[PDB]
Paper text:
Sialic acid-binding Ig-like lectin 15 (Siglec-15) is an immune modulator and emerging cancer immunotherapy target. Sialic acid-binding immunoglobulin (Ig)-like lectin 15 (Siglec-15) is a single-pass transmembrane protein initially described in osteoclasts. Siglec-15 triggers a signaling cascade through its positively charged transmembrane region after association with the immunoreceptor tyrosine-based activation motif (ITAM) adapter proteins DAP10 or DAP12, regulating several biological processes including osteoclast maturation, bone remodeling and susceptibility to fungal infections. Ligation of Siglec-15 suppresses antigen-specific T cell responses, and monoclonal antibodies (mAbs) that block the interaction of Siglec-15 to its binding partner(s) promote antitumor responses and are under evaluation for the treatment of several types of cancer.
To assist the crystallization of the extracellular domain (ECD) of Siglec-15, that consists of two Ig domains (d1 and d2) (Siglec-15d1-d2), we employed the fragment antigen-binding (Fab) of an anti-Siglec-15 mAb as a crystallization chaperone (clone 5G1232). This non-glycosylated Fab was produced by cloning its variable heavy (VH) and light chains (VL) into a Fab scaffold containing human constant heavy (CH) and kappa light chains (CL).
Numbering used by the authors:
A (entry chain M): 1 to 48, 50 to 214
B (entry chain I): 1 to 52, 52A, 54 to 56, 58 to 74, 76 to 82, 82A, 82B, 82C, ...
Amino acid sequence: DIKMTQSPSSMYASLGERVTITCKASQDINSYLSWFQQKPGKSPKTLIYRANRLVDGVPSRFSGSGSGQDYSLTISSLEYEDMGIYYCLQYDEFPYTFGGGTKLEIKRTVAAPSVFIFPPSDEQLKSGTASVVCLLNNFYPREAKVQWKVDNALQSGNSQESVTEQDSKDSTYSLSSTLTLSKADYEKHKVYACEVTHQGLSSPVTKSFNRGE
Amino acid sequence: QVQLQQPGAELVKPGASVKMSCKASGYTFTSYWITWVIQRPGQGLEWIGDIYCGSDTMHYNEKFKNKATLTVDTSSSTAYMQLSSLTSEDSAVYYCARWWDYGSSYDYFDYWGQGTTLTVSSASTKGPSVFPLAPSSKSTSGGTAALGCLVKDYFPEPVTVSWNSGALTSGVHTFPAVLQSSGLYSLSSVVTVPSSSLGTQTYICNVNHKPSNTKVDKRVEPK
């Protein structure tokens, strides 16, 4: 019944910056608010209960404040381990209601992608398909354009991309592009490349390979 | 040593029922509360209901009434949440968490479970095929070499891909699986390793797909 609205929903930040997020309640919950923080795909962790008290193991930089309808969660010096999505939960009235979430993404210096490319495995060719993987490791920001080229001819219609969450140690994104062809069509061309065009590179980086090798 | 164990994933045919287990271990079971939370991926969180393991005194969510039925087994020290009339909407992640001093003014969630990735679909499960992403001349960058394993043509998610049975962790990259046009999933798990140690070290990826009950351990080598 009680609606909790957070702001901002998404936000960037640097290292060591003092960042505060807000969790406003539709009613007066009388300081009965807890702060949760979750990393992508993992279990949530309890940070603060009753909006101002630390859980054992919570770093000293996490602070809580607020009363009545408005509450805040502050980080003293933002570090590369505090990323993820932050949720606030009021437990004063039934039923309990969470917020929309607050995604904290770390801003760092521009990083160039480590471009790799793998030929299709020999076991896969015995099945009838061929999967060529172009790899982009340890780059930032996330926005990167990858283009597949076979025999210098641009291909579009059979590629699938995937970029992981922001790294917990280096604050970087990593992308993986998968090009799947039939066994006959893969053995029809010679040079297979993937053009990686990114902000951290003044010129497109190309990694190619031939079939025979 | 407090520990709460939830299954990795549960495949459910639509319309049928299922049970999610939350096995508590290492502490006094009948002296605490347990709360279930559902998380549909990418969205927020939602409270299902508070349950006391030892008086069966519950606190249900109004919208989750007539849908969820919570249970506790004091023998196995395990909590249970059963879902009925399962549709394509209920496919989400379900957590279980423990309360400390529930009811008092100093109550909060002190321990969390891993979470059950529940996917409701009528399609049959298919095991994955694991192909090695071998290191090559085009797979190195300044004394570092990248190798991996391609987990392809499986359903449904999630699949867990570990390296050397967990012996190697630094520099692993398990990418989110993409949905094929055929209706299957596929991902790759890559690791950046030193190049000089490629002749002496062994890199075996341990792919485990419990929904299909098939576990593939494929060794990947150069050339």
